[PDB]
């Protein structure tokens, strides 16, 4: 039987229990992911269908979560438009020559996912048409986050170079946003057609921006991306850490689910007119506290979230490497058992 | 004439212009600092009073800012109570064995500033009695932030080990908050006594905490600190980046000035009931944009700020190495000119 719990919650419909999944549920927290990675390498496991499919499905099998998140690199579509993502082991995909001028942006092309990223289309097809009895979430990075990779080149805590570029070259910035939007929409559209039943947009670094600059430089292209993607008739989610101050503006966009970090609580969100379905809150660092703490913190979040039907439980950030899979197994059952009891 | 503009604004009293200073105005943004550092080394520059005083006064002389911030390392008072320091510099100052048990906390001593950090006292006296025509701001790190350095040891992005500790062992955590409070109060008191006319507490990493955890584990000890320190009759400021969601709770404390990062706007803070004097707010990354963008974004902040007497202009974080002194000199003149024109 197909588990519809996640999609019911995503569209604010009644369901029997609260659905769960975790950002980075498939990844370094799992002993088998690591082993597979050291055996086949990052490239084969981000690019080989039989392998990507295994990594994606594992957490579902091991935790009994209500959704699978497609395992792949956030930078996957970039080479299609002419940006070369290189690197070399432990800090793999990095960008050789950063965006510096308007002429760099003008030479950017277009994705043809059927031809350019066939391996991801095939993985989705294998997973959806043949493997999962749980919905598959496809994903893409957002424009700001992708532009930050393309513009910093090297690693950044503050995103000064990216933001200075944004401020100094508004016209170039707008064109870059447009080129990336083109790519994101086509990339996401192909993921949905191949089987994906929801999509999450990760805007990991956009919390570096205040509300004023989000609206000036970022909000319009986001409006374009979600307005287009809404025609695909699948739940659209957005998450980025440290971006609580941007929740209302995200709520304005034609997305369906607003992902929260641990600094905007559910009652607080509703109290601010956040009315669409809400995703996750649990601070990932709590997963390292004694069970007493995990439970008290999780029960509080569930209690608030179960006030309406539009609620998916998740963390307020990604699972990190030294999180115990045993803790995630136990957490997932607690959420399921606690919520279904409540909903009886 | 001594320039008292800064102190008036902090007390929410009428002044003829808006006072300005910048977090990290003395540092690697300056050629003189960089040369001084390669000449004498980090230790000499943070320990010889004549060098520390030079470092501290240089931005005042170069830019004409309205206050000096004491140049010293944030770890300064920690060896005095028995914690490790020094190291490699690449990744900051390292702490050997981190706090793990209650015994590790129980063994911590008390600071005798005269005996322990006399060079800081000497620097403050040199500056105030002989050099500065501008208030000297003293400073200390906050308990949470200082606790974080002591518990992570290494370089941290999300402070999971500290949070884990705080949750797992709350009794020990209270004792640590208590031991750090004591040190901070005596340290700050001594800086006031040497001649500091204001005090800034830096809680750099506290924004990792949501409101509930702030109230449970941090608000009590902070209330104690500002209660005791309020008795000195000097303006008390608190800043920490990424902490806009905690600004209401800081405003509750007997401090005088709320420091804002760029994500809580001035008007916005006022409508949220933040009524006490407010400091700073310009996104430092704007300093790399063309002058016209800088002037315009600053003017937007000044217009909000000048709605009450309680307003000190600053950045929303610290000056970073790539910032031009020319820019900061020109920004300082503008803030003075614009506000004076507007106030007259």
């Amino acid at each position: 039987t197909f588990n519809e719990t996640f999609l019911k919650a995503a569209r604010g419909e009644k369901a029997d229990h609260t659905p769960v999944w975790y950002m980075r549920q498939a990844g370094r927290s799992q002993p088998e992911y690591r082993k597979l990675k050291e055996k086949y390498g990052l490239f084969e496991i981000t690019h080989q269908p039989e392998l990507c499919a295994y990594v994606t499905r594992l957490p579902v099998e091991q935790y009994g979560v209500d959704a699978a998140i497609l395992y792949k690199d956030i930078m996957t579509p970039l080479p299609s438009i002419g940006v070369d993502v290189e690197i070399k082991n432990g800090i793999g995909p990095v960008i050789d020559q950063p965006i510096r001028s308007l002429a760099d942006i003008e030479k950017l092309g277009q994705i043809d996912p059927e031809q350019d990223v066939p391996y991801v289309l095939e993985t989705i097809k294998l997973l959806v048409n043949e493997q999962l009895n749980v919905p598959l979430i496809g994903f893409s990075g957002a424009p700001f986050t992708l532009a930050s990779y393309m513009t910093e080149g090297g690693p950044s805590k503050n995103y000064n170079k990216t933001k200075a570029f944004m401020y100094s070259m508004p016209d170039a910035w707008n064109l870059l946003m447009s080129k990336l939007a083109d790519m994101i929409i086509v990339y996401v559209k192909a993921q949905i057609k191949a089987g994906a039943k929801a999509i999450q947009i990760f805007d990991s670094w956009v919390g570096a921006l205040n509300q004023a600059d989000y609206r000036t430089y970022i909000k319009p292209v986001m409006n374009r991306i979600f307005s287009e993607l809404a025609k695909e008739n699948v739940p659209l989610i957005m998450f980025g850490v440290g971006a609580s101050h941007l929740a209302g503006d995200w709520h304005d966009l034609p997305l369906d689910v607003v992902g929260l970090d641990w600094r905007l609580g559910i009652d607080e969100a509703r109290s601010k007119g956040i009315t669409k379905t809400v995703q996750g809150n649990l601070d990932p660092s709590i997963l390292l506290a004694p069970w007493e703490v995990i439970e008290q913190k999780t029960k509080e979040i569930l209690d608030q979230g179960m006030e309406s039907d539009g609620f998916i439980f998740n963390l307020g950030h990604g699972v990190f490497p030294d999180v115990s899979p045993e803790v995630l197994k136990k957490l997932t059952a607690f959420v399921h058992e606690y919520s279904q009891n409540k909903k009886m």
Side-chain angles (χ1 to χ4, degrees), chain A residues 1-84 90 92-344:
Chain A
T1 309
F2 196 82
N3 179 176
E4 297 282 3
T5 313
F6 169 79
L7 298 167
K8 286 180 172 193
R11 58 178 110 94
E13 299 182 8
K14 278 159 84 70
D16 294 305
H17 70 270
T18 291
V20 198
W21 71 278
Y22 315 107
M23 293 166 294
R24 292 186 177 192
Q25 45 185 29
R28 278 150 70 212
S29 57
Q30 300 169 289
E32 34 275 301
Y33 171 93
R34 289 172 166 149
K35 289 187 186 90
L36 196 87
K37 189 184 167 171
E38 68 76 28
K39 194 194 188 198
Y40 292 101
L42 226 175
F43 196 85
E44 278 279 303
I45 301 156
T46 44
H47 291 247
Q48 193 81 354
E50 297 269 4
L51 297 175
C52 294
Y54 173 65
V55 165
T56 308
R57 80 174 142 104
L58 254 182
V60 185
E61 309 183 326
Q62 293 186 323
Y63 307 147
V65 286
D66 301 82
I69 175 88
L70 186 61
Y71 173 80
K72 68 193 164 60
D73 173 48
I74 204 157
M75 286 184 38
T76 295
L78 287 173
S80 294
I81 67 168
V83 9
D84 215 322
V94 296
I95 298 167
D96 29 7
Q97 51 202 112
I99 298 312
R100 288 158 190 196
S101 69
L102 177 64
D104 293 340
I105 301 158
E106 254 144 43
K107 62 178 72 141
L108 301 171
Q110 285 174 296
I111 188 167
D112 180 16
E114 209 73 27
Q115 202 196 29
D116 300 342
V117 293
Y119 54 97
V120 24
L121 273 31
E122 152 147 42
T123 303
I124 300 167
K125 216 143 291 161
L126 188 66
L127 282 163
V128 175
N129 213 58
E130 288 203 324
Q131 284 198 329
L132 298 165
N133 282 288
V134 127
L136 178 73
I137 315 157
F139 88 82
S140 173
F144 179 79
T145 294
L146 297 173
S148 301
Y149 281 112
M150 297 177 297
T151 310
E152 301 289 323
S156 169
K157 195 147 278 194
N158 279 127
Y159 292 114
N160 296 330
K161 289 175 204 280
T162 301
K163 285 157 90 183
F165 185 87
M166 190 185 67
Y167 296 132
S168 310
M169 297 198 67
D171 279 22
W173 176 263
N174 250 48
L175 189 51
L176 180 54
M177 290 300 92
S178 193
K179 295 270 182 177
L180 291 166
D182 287 350
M183 179 198 71
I184 291 163
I185 297 165
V186 183
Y187 183 50
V188 169
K189 268 197 173 46
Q191 289 180 54
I192 294 157
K193 288 204 220 173
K197 297 189 166 185
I199 301 289
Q200 184 149 326
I201 306 288
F202 290 96
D203 211 355
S204 314
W205 302 324
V206 79
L209 267 53
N210 62 29
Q211 167 179 61
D213 294 333
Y214 186 80
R215 296 163 154 194
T216 304
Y217 297 105
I218 316 298
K219 195 160 170 169
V221 68
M222 296 312 90
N223 184 53
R224 184 168 141 218
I225 292 167
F226 290 107
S227 300
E228 286 304 306
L229 293 185
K231 310 172 205 268
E232 303 310 301
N233 299 120
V234 300
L236 306 165
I237 314 152
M238 184 160 251
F239 178 85
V241 81
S244 289
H245 64 288
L246 306 174
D249 292 284
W250 287 11
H251 186 82
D252 293 339
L253 306 159
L255 51 70
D256 302 289
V257 187
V258 181
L260 307 168
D261 81 359
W262 65 100
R263 297 111 149 168
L264 185 57
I266 296 161
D267 290 355
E268 201 185 340
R270 308 301 183 186
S271 154
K272 285 185 173 86
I274 292 153
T275 218
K276 287 164 173 181
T277 141
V278 132
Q279 184 173 265
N281 207 235
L282 189 73
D283 184 357
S285 58
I286 289 156
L287 301 165
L288 294 168
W291 179 256
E292 305 81 284
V293 178
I294 322 270
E295 191 172 88
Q296 195 284 298
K297 286 275 177 185
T298 310
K299 183 207 285 168
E300 205 192 313
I301 297 160
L302 301 179
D303 282 1
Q304 285 171 52
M306 293 187 297
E307 279 304 284
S308 87
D309 298 308
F311 166 57
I312 303 142
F313 185 78
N314 206 310
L315 312 176
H317 201 15
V319 178
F320 48 87
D322 42 20
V323 165
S324 182
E326 280 307 302
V327 169
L328 294 172
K329 192 175 179 175
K330 205 208 184 179
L331 180 63
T332 309
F334 173 70
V335 170
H336 281 166
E337 290 156 353
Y338 186 79
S339 57
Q340 88 151 31
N341 186 251
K342 150 89 195 153
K343 289 174 187 290
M344 273 203 90

